[model samples]
Target chain A: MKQKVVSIGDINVANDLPFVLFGGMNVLESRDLAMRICEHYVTVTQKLGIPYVFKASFDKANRSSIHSYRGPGLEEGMKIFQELKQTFGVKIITDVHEPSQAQPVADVVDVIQLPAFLARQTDLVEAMAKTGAVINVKKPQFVSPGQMGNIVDKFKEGGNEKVILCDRGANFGYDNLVVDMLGFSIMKKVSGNSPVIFDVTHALQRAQVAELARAGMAVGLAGLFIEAHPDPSALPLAKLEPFLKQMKAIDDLVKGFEELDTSK
Target chain B: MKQKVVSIGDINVANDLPFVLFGGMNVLESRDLAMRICEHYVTVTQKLGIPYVFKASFDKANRSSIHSYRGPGLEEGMKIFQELKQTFGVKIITDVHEPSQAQPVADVVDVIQLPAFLARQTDLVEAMAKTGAVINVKKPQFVSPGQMGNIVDKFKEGGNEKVILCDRGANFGYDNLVVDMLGFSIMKKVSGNSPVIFDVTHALQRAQVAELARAGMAVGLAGLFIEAHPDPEPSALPLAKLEPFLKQMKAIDDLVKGFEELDTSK
Candidate 1:
C-alpha cells in the first residue's frame, strides 16, 4: 500500500494531503432520512469532483431539549453506514460517544471522528486511537485552536500517526460563535504539519436567547460546514440556510483569505 | 400591597421597584431544582426577613446542542408552579417561548421571564411586557452587561417599567465561561436602576467541551447560585458543579470578586 504523507503546516498526517471535513447531520430527520441525505452528499461530491467523507452521528446526546431525538441506535445506524460505504465506496467518518463503541465502530469506519463535546475525553481518545483508524479530532469550541496540538499528542502518544486537526468556531459573546482567522495561522504553526480542516456549519449557528433581535450581526467564520437540504424547513437537518445566508453576507471576508499571505 | 425594598446599588426591588422582569429557565432540572432550592431560601429569608422572588424555565431555546433537554412541557409545570405560589404566597417567575403561552401564564405567574435565546425577540419582549406582569429579563450571555439598556428599552417601549436585569455569565473562550466582576457595575450603569441579581449556580457550569480535562479549570465566577442537595449525585438535578469544585466555589468567588475589586478599582 502506498503511504500518504499529510502535512498541515509542519504537522503531518501519515505524510499526505490534508483531510477536509464537512459538518455533521442534525436531526431535521430520521436515520433513514439522514442516510438519504448522506447518500445524496456522496453523489453530489462525486459529481462535483470534490473528495468527500460522509459524517453523521447515530445519537445526539447534547440537545438543548432533553426530549429531543437522539438517532437510530448504534447497531442499526452503523449497519446502514456499513451498507452505505460498501455500496457507495465513499470514505466514511462518524463520532463515537463512549469508549466501548470505539472497537465496534473501528470494524467498519475508515476514520474515527471525535465530537467536540467529548474531545477532552482522554480515555475515549486513546481508545479510538488504538483502533488504528485515521483520527480527526475536533478542537473543543472552548479551547484555542492552537491548543489542538495537545489533543493530537494524545493520539500520537498512543502510536497513531494519522491525525487530522479540525477547527470549528469558538464561543463568542453569549450564544455567539466566531472563528478567529488567527486560529488558522496559529494552528498551522502549532501543528507543525498536521492537516487542519475548518468546520463551517457549526460556526454559523451562533444565536443568542433572542432569535430576532440581532438580525444583522457579524459572523466571523472560517470554511463553512454547511448542511444543505433540498427543502430546509420540512427536512430534519438542523437549519443551516440561515447560517449559509450569514456566510454569504460575509463571503467577502472569506475571499480575503485568498489574498492573505500564508508565506510568513 | 406593602413591598419589600432590597437595594442593589441605587436600584431597589420594592413596591416602588421600577421594573418588572421575565427570565427564561433553560433546564427543567435547573427550574425545579432552582425552585426547590429557592423554596428553602424563601423560607430562610422569610425567617430572616428578606424579600423574595422565585423563577424557573421550561425551555432553553438558545442551546448549542439541538438535542439538549428543554424544561418540562409548559401546561403541567406552570400548574405546579401556580399551586405552589397559591399555597405558599411566594412570587413566581416563569418564561414564555411562543406568544400564546404569555396570556394564559400571565394570569397565574407573578413574573414572565424571557429566555436569553429569545432576548432579541422584540415582539416577544413586547408581548411579555404587555402582560403587565413583572419581567426579569436576562442579559444575553453574549452581550456585555453594558449593552443591557438596549434590551431593557425593548420592554420599556412596550410600556412595561417593571424589569430586573440578571447576569449569568459571558462567553470567554469556547466552552469556557467567564463572569466579569465589572460586569455587574457596568450592567447596572447601562440598565440604570434595573435590579441586578447575580446568578451563582448556572454561571459555574463547565461550558467547555473538555469536561474531564478541564474539570478542575476555574470557571471564574462571582456571586453564587448554588443548588445544594444532601446527595447531589443521586438527586434528580442536572449537575452544574463544573465551575471550581463546589467546596471551593464560595471561597473562590469571594477571593476572586474581592481581588477583582482591588485590581479594577485601583
Candidate 2:
C-alpha cells in the first residue's frame, strides 16, 4: 500500500498528525466503469495539486431498502482498487465493518475506514489499527462531537496515532440530518493534535431521499465525501443522479471548497 | 366540523377557545385500528387531557420518491375521518397544502393543517384561516420554533386566533433532526395564548433516512407525535412501533422538565 498523506487547515497529515481523514464514494458500474472512475479521480486530484486520498465503498451497509445494491464483493472490488492504485499512484481509503476484513484490505487500501455505526466496536477498531494503516473514524450522529475523544482513546490505546475523525451529521428529527458547524470546532479541540475532516457531500444528502431530496447543494461544504459516478442516477447501487450529472456537480462542488480561504 | 376546542397547561378548551386544535392521523384500517391509535393518544392527555384535537395529513406532501404512496387523498380519506368522529365523537384534524384545498377539506375535517414547508405562504395561511377551520400550523424544520410566532401572527392579522402551534423538530446536523426541548418551551411561550403540540412521529425520523436512521431518543420531550404501524418494517409510511416500545421508552427517557432539577453544585 502507498503511504498515507492528507492536508487540512495548517496541519500536515503524516503518520504523526493527530487525525486521519478521507472522503466516501459509492462503487457503481462494471469493472471497466470502476477503473474509469478511479482514473478520473487520480487525474482530477493530481491536476488540482490537492494532497488528496480517494475513498469509495464496494458495499453500502446502510441503505433504505434491503433490495438496494451493495457493491462488488471483497475480492472483485479489492482487485479493481489495486489496479487503480498501480495505474494512478494515488493513496486509497475504504471502509470495513467485519473484523476479519481489516488486515487483507489494509494491504491494498492505504487507510482503513471505520463507519459511524461501528465506531464503538473495540475489536474492529483494534484490528484495523494493528494493520498499521491510518484509521479514519466517523463520529456517530447520536453522540456529540465532544464525545469523540473518548472513542479515539479506544484506537490510541492500541499505540496508533494515524487516526482521523469525521463529523458526518447529527440526528434532528425523524428522517432528517443536521450539520453542526460548531461540531467541527468541538472535534478539533478534543482531538488535540488530530486533524478533523468535515464531510460536505454526505452532509448535504437529504435523509428522506427515499421520500424526497430536500436540502442539497454545493455552497455549504467544508470537506467533501461525494459519491461520484462517471453516472450516479443510473448506478445500480443507489441511483441519486445520472452519473455524468453527478460527476459534473462534484467537480464544481470541490472547486467551491478550494476558493474558501480558511487559513487563519 | 365539530366546534373548535382549545386549551394549554390547565387552561380550558371551550367552543370559544382562541385557536382550533386538530388531532393527527390518516384514513387508517378498521375502526378497531383507528380507535386503537386514538386510545394511545388518549393516554397522552389522560394526564392533562387538554381539549383533544386529532390531526393527520389526509395526504402526505413531501414523500421521498415519486413512487412512494400518499395517503387516501382528500376525498376518501376525509370520509374515513368523518366516520371516526361520528363513532368516537372526538374532533378531527387534517392538513392541506394548496389554497384550493381549504374549503372542501374544511367541510369534512374539523381543523385544517398547514405543511411546514408552506408554513410561511401568505395565500395559504389567509385562505385556510378564512374558512374558520381552526388552523393548526406546523413549524418548518428549517426555522426555530419561536419563529413560528410570526407564523401565528400571520393568521391573527388575518382575523383567525384559532391556531395551534406544533413543533415537529428543528434542523440539527445533515439529514438528521434534533428536538431542542427548549423548542417546546419556546413555542409554548411565544404562542402564549395558543395551544402547542409536539409531533412525535416526524420528529423521530432521521433528517436523512435515505442513508440511515438517526433518532434523538434522549432529547427532552413534552409530548410525542409517534406513528405506530402494526408492523413498521413493511408499513407504507415510516411505521414506528406501538404501545410496548413506547411504554418501554417512557420508562427510561427523562422529560424536559426533569432537566430543571440539575445539580447546581456542578
Candidate 3:
C-alpha cells in the first residue's frame, strides 16, 4: 500500500516522514495561555528539528459534567488560532463538534479534528470533509484500532481523502484507559497506510502505569500529540520533557535500523 | 452493599452464591441442533450438579457480514426454548435484538439477554426491563467494566433491579479480544454487587493465548459462561474437558472468596 502524506502547511505527515509533534494545552484557556504554551512547543520542536502542529480543544463539549469548563467559543478560539499561526508560523489543529462549526474552524485551522466521541457520526465526518482541510481522526475510547478504517472510509466517502489517525486510548476499565501500542501498526495497516499519531498526554494519565509498554511501542508512529499546563508544577512537565527526549531517541533508533527482510 | 441473588426457577445467581453455569450453543441452528447441544450441556452440568442456565442467541443482528448464520428467528427459537425448558426442566436464557420481542421471549426464557452491541440502547434496556425478567447484561467490547454500572443503572432506572453482568471480552487490539479477569471484581464493586459471570468460551478463544494470565484471574468471577459443539472433532473439546482445569478454576474461586480479610495496603 502507498503511504498517504497529509500536509499541514509545509509540514508533511506520513509514516515515512519525520515524526510531527501536535502539542498544546488541553483547552485554550486564554489567548495569553495559548501563546505561552504554543511558544514553548514551537521552541522545543524547532530545537529538536521536529515538524509541529499546535493542538487544543476550542470547546470540550463532552466534559463529564455540564459545570466543567469549556474553552473560548468558536469565534474567540479562531482569533487565538489566527494569532498563533501568524506569530509562530506553525500549523494549528483544533476539534469541532457540530457540522456548522467545520467550515469556519477549517478556515483558520490548518487541520480540523474529529473528536473521538463524534468520530463515527456520518454528518460530522462529511461536514469536516467538505471543509477540504486535512482531517485528524481521534480513535474513540470505545473503538478498536482495527475499526479505524471505517472512520477513514467515512471521511474518504465524503470526498476528503487526506486523513490522519490519532490514538488517545481505549476504555480499559471503569475510569481507566490503555494505549495498546500494538494498535498503531494495526491502525496503519487497516487504514490503508494512513499516518497514525499518539496523544501521549491523555494516554499518560493512566498510561504511566503501562509506561514500559508505551515506550517499547513508540517506534511505530507518524506523530505524537501531547498537552501541557502553563504551570509545570501542576502537571508533570519535568517528566514530559524527558519523555519527549526519549521519544526522539527511540524514533531515530527505530528508523535507523535496517528491515530484517524475513519474507523468505 | 448487599449481594443480590437473581433466581431463575430453583437456580440462584449471585456473586456470593456458588458458581453457576450459563452454557450452550452459540446459536439455535435448528431445533435438533439446539436439542443435541443443550442435552450435552445438561448431561455435563447435571453430573457436576452445577447451577445451570442454558444460553443461545436467536438472532445475531450485528454479525460481521450479512450472510453469516443468525440462528432460527424468535418464533421458532422460543418454541425450541420451551421444549428445552419442558424436557430438561432447566432455566433458559436467550438474547433479544428489538424491543418488541422482549415480552414474548421473556415469557419463555428465564433470562432475557442484552446483546453487547445494543447494551447502551435506552429503548432496548427499557423494553427488557418492562418484561420484569432477570436481565443478563453483556459487557460491551468497547466499554470498561467500571462503566458497566451505567448499564445496570439504566436497567434499574427502567424499574428492573434484577441484573447480571456478563463479560465476553474487551477489544485488546485490532481483531483481538482479551478478558481482564480483574474486571470481574471491578464489575462486582461498581454494579452494586451484581452477579458477574465470565463468558469462558469466547474468552477461551483468546484466553488460550494469555492462558496463564486468565487462569490466574478467573478466580474473581461469580460464574462461567461457555459453549461446546456436539461434533467436537472440529473444536477442542478434549482440552476444555480436562477435569483438572475445572478443579483448578473452582479452587481459585474458593480461595479468592476466602481471602476477604487479607490486608496488604501497608
Best by DockQ, which number? 2
lDDT of all predictions:
0.55, 0.60, 0.75
**Which digits, one per residue and each the tens of the lDDT, describe model 2 over residues A145-185?**
88988877777787677777776788776666777766765
In the range B4-46, model 1's lDDT, one tens digit per residue, is 3433323346322322222223345644555555556456444
Candidate 3 C-alpha error for residue B102, in Å: 2.9
lDDT of 2 by residue, B1-266 (tens): 33234533334343223222233345454556666666655555443333455655667778799777777677777777787778666666678989989989988876688888999899999889888777667789999877777888888888888787777767765666666665665765576545565565666533232111113223333333334444444112233333334443344333422444466569
Deviating ranges (above 4 Å) for candidate 2: A1-11, A14-24, A63-68, A206-223, A233-264, B1-266
RMSD of each: 14.8, 12.2, 8.6
What is the DockQ score, from 0 to 1, of model 3?
A: 0.09
Q: List chain B TM-scores, each candidate.
A: 0.66, 0.69, 0.88
Q: What ordering of candidates by DockQ runs from best to worst?
A: 2, 1, 3
Per-residue alpha-carbon lDDT of candidate 3 for residues A12-35, written as tens digits (9 for 90 to 100): 988866777787778888888889
* TM-score of every candidate relative to the true structure: 0.46, 0.46, 0.56
Against the true structure, whose TM-score is highest?
A: 3
Q: Write the per-residue lDDT of candidate 1 for residues A115-211, one digit (tens) a residue.
A: 8756765556778878887777877666777677777666777667677766666777644677675675566556665655666556666333112
Number of the top lDDT candidate: 3
Give the share of true interchain contacts found in each model: 0.20, 0.40, 0.11
DockQ values, each candidate: 0.09, 0.21, 0.09
Q: Give each model's clash number.
A: 68, 70, 1
